[PDB]
Amino acid sequence: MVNWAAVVDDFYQELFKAHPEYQNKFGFKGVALGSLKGNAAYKTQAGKVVDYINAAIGGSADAAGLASRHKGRNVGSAEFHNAKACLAKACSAHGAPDLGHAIDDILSHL
Ligand code: HEM
Known part of the structure; x- marks a missing residue:
């Protein structure tokens, strides 16, 4: 199987390197x-993201619900466009399929 756990780890490394302030919204702020x-905190959150990716691939992801929850943290389309780039870099680093269509699905609700 694709190592999505490793993909997500590299995703958060890319994300917080480019936008360290985004880390302040999580339970691992400051780490x-x-x-x-x-x-x-981070192990739990990464596991949720891995679960979401496997749900999106598997056909059960609720992009609207995820979008709504992110708006509930004052996270919007700008942040998601940045995340889309970081995730494309992480997928490439692992030879994993790109997840841009899944992120587009979330963006369509932001
Ligand atoms: C590839 C883009 C992203 C994906 C797939 C994603 C996925 C997720 C998932 C699956 C959850 C858990 C939701 C739940 O438990 O129902 C979550 C929570 C969260 N996300 Fe994201 N996320 C993305 C980008 C972002 C960005 C750019 C931010 C900016 C700060 C962000 C901030 C948060 C916050 C603050 C939470 C709540 C964490 C907590 O409960 O402590 N996310 N995200």
Whole structure:
């Protein structure tokens, strides 16, 4: 199977390197990037993201519901366009299929 856990780890490295302030919205605010993998909040959140990717591939993802929850954290289409780029870099680093269509599905509700 594609190692989505590793893809997501590289995704958050790319995301928070480019936009460190986005990290302040999570339970691992303030934690050094090189130690995220040892942080309990981060392990939980990454696992949710992996689950969402597997749901999107599997055909069960609720993009509208995810979008609504992100608006509920004052996260919008600008942030998602940045994430789309970071995720494309992470997928490429692992030879994983690009997830741009899944992110577009979320964007269509933002
Ligand atoms: C590839 C783009 C992204 C995907 C696939 C994604 C996915 C997810 C998922 C699956 C959850 C958990 C939702 C739930 O439990 O129902 C979540 C929560 C969250 N996301 Fe994202 N996300 C993305 C981008 C972003 C960006 C750019 C931000 C900017 C800060 C962000 C901020 C948050 C926050 C603050 C939470 C709540 C975390 C908490 O409960 O402590 N997300 N996201």
